[PDB]
Amino acid sequence: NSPHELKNAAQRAADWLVERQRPNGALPSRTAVIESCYKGMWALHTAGHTQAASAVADYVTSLLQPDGDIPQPREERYFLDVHYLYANGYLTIGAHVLGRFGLSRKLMSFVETMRNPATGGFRSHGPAIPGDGRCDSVSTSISGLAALYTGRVDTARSAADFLGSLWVGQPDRKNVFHAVADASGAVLTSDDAVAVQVRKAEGDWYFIGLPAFFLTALYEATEDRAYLDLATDLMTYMDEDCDEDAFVDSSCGKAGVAAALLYRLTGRPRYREIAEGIGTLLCERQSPYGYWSEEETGDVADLFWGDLDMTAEYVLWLDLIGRNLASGERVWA
Amino acid sequence: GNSPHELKNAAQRAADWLVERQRPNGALPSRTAVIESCYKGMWALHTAGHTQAASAVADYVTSLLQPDGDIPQPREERYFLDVHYLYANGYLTIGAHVLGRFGLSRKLMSFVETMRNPATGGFRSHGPAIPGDGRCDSVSTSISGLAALYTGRVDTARSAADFLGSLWVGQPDRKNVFHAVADASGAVLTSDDAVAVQVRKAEGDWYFIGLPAFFLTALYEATEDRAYLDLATDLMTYMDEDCDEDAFVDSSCGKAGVAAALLYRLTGRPRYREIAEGIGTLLCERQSPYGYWSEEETGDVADLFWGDLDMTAEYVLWLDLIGRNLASGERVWA
Numbered sequence: 001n002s003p004h005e006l007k008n009a010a011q012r013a014a015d016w017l018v019e020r021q022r023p024n025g026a027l028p029s030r031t032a033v034i035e036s037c038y039k040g041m042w043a044l045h046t047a048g049h050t051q052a053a054s055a056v057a058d059y060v061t062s063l064l065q066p067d068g069d070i071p072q073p074r075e076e077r078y079f080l081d082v083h084y085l086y087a088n089g090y091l092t093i094g095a096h097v098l099g100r101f102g103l104s105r106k107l108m109s110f111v112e113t114m115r116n117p118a119t120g121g122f123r124s125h126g127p128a129i130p131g132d133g134r135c136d137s138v139s140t141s142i143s144g145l146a147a148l149y150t151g152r153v154d155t156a157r158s159a160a161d162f163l164g165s166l167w168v169g170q171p172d173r174k175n176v177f178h179a180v181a182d183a184s185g186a187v188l189t190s191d192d193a194v195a196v197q198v199r200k201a202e203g204d205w206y207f208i209g210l211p212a213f214f215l216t217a218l219y220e221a222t223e224d225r226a227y228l229d230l231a232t233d234l235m236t237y238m239d240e241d242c243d244e245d246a247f248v249d250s251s252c253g254k255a256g257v258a259a260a261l262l263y264r265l266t267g268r269p270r271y272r273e274i275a276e277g278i279g280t281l282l283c284e285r286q287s288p289y290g291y292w293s294e295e296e297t298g299d300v301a302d303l304f305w306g307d308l309d310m311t312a313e314y315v316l317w318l319d320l321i322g323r324n325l326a327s328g329e330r331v332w333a
Numbered sequence: 334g335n336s337p338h339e340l341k342n343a344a345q346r347a348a349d350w351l352v353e354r355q356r357p358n359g360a361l362p363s364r365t366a367v368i369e370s371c372y373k374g375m376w377a378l379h380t381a382g383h384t385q386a387a388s389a390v391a392d393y394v395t396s397l398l399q400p401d402g403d404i405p406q407p408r409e410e411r412y413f414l415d416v417h418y419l420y421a422n423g424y425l426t427i428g429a430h431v432l433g434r435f436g437l438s439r440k441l442m443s444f445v446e447t448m449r450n451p452a453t454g455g456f457r458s459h460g461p462a463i464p465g466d467g468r469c470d471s472v473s474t475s476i477s478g479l480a481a482l483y484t485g486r487v488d489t490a491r492s493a494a495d496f497l498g499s500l501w502v503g504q505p506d507r508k509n510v511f512h513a514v515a516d517a518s519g520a521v522l523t524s525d526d527a528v529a530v531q532v533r534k535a536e537g538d539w540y541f542i543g544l545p546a547f548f549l550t551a552l553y554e555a556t557e558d559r560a561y562l563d564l565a566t567d568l569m570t571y572m573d574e575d576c577d578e579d580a581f582v583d584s585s586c587g588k589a590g591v592a593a594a595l596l597y598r599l600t601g602r603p604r605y606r607e608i609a610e611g612i613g614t615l616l617c618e619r620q621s622p623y624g625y626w627s628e629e630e631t632g633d634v635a636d637l638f639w640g641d642l643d644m645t646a647e648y649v650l651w652l653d654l655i656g657r658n659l660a661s662g663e664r665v666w667a
């Protein structure tokens with residue numbers, strides 16, 4: 001598919017969401033949880049549905065606590081002790097791009113209270129959830145990206161330092177990507193820490209793909225080739241050392257965005273190929289009705305939270321892939 | 334008046350009109366290749382969902398970017414040389430940043446900061462290649478402050494607000510004229526060569542007041558410092574009660590309309606809803622059947638005079654911002 005076609009798919013999905021948005025601004029999830037709609041502000045704004053995006057901001061604002069967190073409603077364990085701040089990161093970006101500067105300042109200030117100042121990582125478990133202070137690549141990358149959008153570039157550079165340390169410290173990168181470090185900054189290989197089985201088709205690739213996207217954006221912001229080189233290390237790892245599932249699994253969109261940005265910035269044709277392939281696959285999986293769903297077909301009035309999240313996520317990724325491929329073609333051809 | 338949905342529909346048709354005519358290099362369809370024809374394009378088109386077109390404008394803008402972070406050329410209109418040079422740079426910075434073109438936004442914003450007066454917080458009216466006396470005006474300062482808020486440079490925004498407060502307090506004859514320019518020391522400039530708004534006449538340039546009102550409201554949203562809300566409030570009251578009706582009718586009234594819509598969302602004051610609704614309806618009613626805006630052009634044209642291309646992108650942005658703040662304000666307060 002062409003960049004225009006990727007965007008057409010994103011717009012059909014955004015229209016589907018907006019048609020079913022609730023009066024208070026919540027998106028049509030079968031459970032009322034923040035993990036169903038945290039990407040909604042940014043995705044809907046990207047699609048030009050700024051009134052719907054602002055309505056999500058109104059809903060988010062009504063859940064905001066005095067410390068700047070949204071601790072509830074949350075049910076999915078990945079949003080409790082694996083990467084709690086994954087929700088907060090997209091909320092911060094979406095609020096900021098909408099110009100909701102009070103919301104973005106309060107959300108980002110809370111995010112920063114969970115940063116480990118010695119390692120640059122962001123803690124995996126939220127304030128109400130007990131934990132050992134471990135920090136993971138997804139919490140850290142999304143918090144770094146939110147830092148870029150809010151202008152906290154020092155925080156973003158520190159997040160990149162953590163990701164570099166995590167990458168250098170891998171004990172067996174050919175077989176496993178250990179996505180977590182302890183509070184001292186050493187890679188956590190324990191049974192209970194997220195680990196991508198890179199030679200199996202078992203998903204979780206965004207623990208590598210989201211760092212690759214963030215580091216590429218940080219390179220764009222700073223021109224520091226250390227970040228480009230880490231991003232390309234991660235992309236080459238996914239392309240050459242990881243299972244084919246890395247560019248096929250539902251979580252491959254992050255890598256697709258990173259590849260499209262890398263193509264615009266470097267012109268290397270393999271990055272265009274990776275991005276085009278991922279964009280086309282996501283486009284092919286879209287329901288004729290406009291949403292994306294693991295298991296459901298037909299004309300549903302709402303979705304389970306994970307499918308609703310995936311639908312907003314693919315609005316964002318197809319848009320970002322499409323615009324970076326379009327501009328890359330202009331710049332390099 | 335018209336509903337938020339109707340305001341957005343007008344914005345979308347104008348954005349479609351622009352994208353249909355965008356050139357392969359990303360330039361918008363201006364009869365003259367000048368930065369003042371498309372400086373609002375990245376932000377306006379992104380707000381309309383036309384992100385590939387917005388990124389194409391970013392590509393065009395990037396092709397003009399100089400090593401110091403400025404776009405000194407192509408520029409032809411005097412207002413973009415020695416009245417408010419940075420007016421172009423400010424929207425370019427915002428549009429680049431919201432698109433995530435972080436290298437472009439950092440470079441642009443870093444140049445903007447070189448024209449800041451560190452004693453007063455104002456921003457110089459004339460660019461590096463344009464000889465001048467160091468005067469600073471309300472529009473250069475407000476747009477640079479707004480760009481500072483989008484890029485997270487909040488201290489720079491606060492300093493811009495300080496300048497605006499000094500400019501307001503220092504007015505020598507506010508019932509008859511708003512002098513929008515200060516000297517390099519911050520004293521209000523009353524010479525004939527310095528922008529003045531004849532507030533009891535219907536002669537335009539109201540955005541020298543309206544843009545400060547919008548920026549200060551956004552700064553209040555960002556900080557909750559009531560000093561900024563109070564100054565924005567005072568400027569809106571000035572426009573509503575001491576200025577000619579033209580302040581909410583002239584082609585430049587969109588800035589005040591956006592400020593009113595945001596103030597309504599933040600405070601719930603009904604007068605701000607009324608001001609924003611009336612301005613939004615007026616701009617909607619002035620749109621051509623084709624999609625563009627122009628006070629003179631009436632034909633099915635393939636391009637526009639630079640000022641009408643700028644106005645068209647500007648009203649895409651203002652109708653979007655008015656609409657979303659009115660809709661959210663209704664949800665919160667009504």
Ligand SMILES: *[C@@H](O)[C@H](NC(C)=O)[C@@H](O)[C@H]1O[C@H](O[C@H]2[C@H](O)[C@@H](O)[C@H](N)C[C@@H]2N)[C@H](N)C[C@@H]1O
Pocket residue numbers: 078202203204205206249250251252306309310313
């Ligand atoms: C990245 O945002 C993930 N999004 C998608 C569409 O995968 C993330 O929101 C999501 O990932 C986890 O669950 C995924 C898993 O990583 C995939 O490999 C699997 N094919 C599907 C599953 N939804 C995480 N448990 C929950 C997150 O919502």
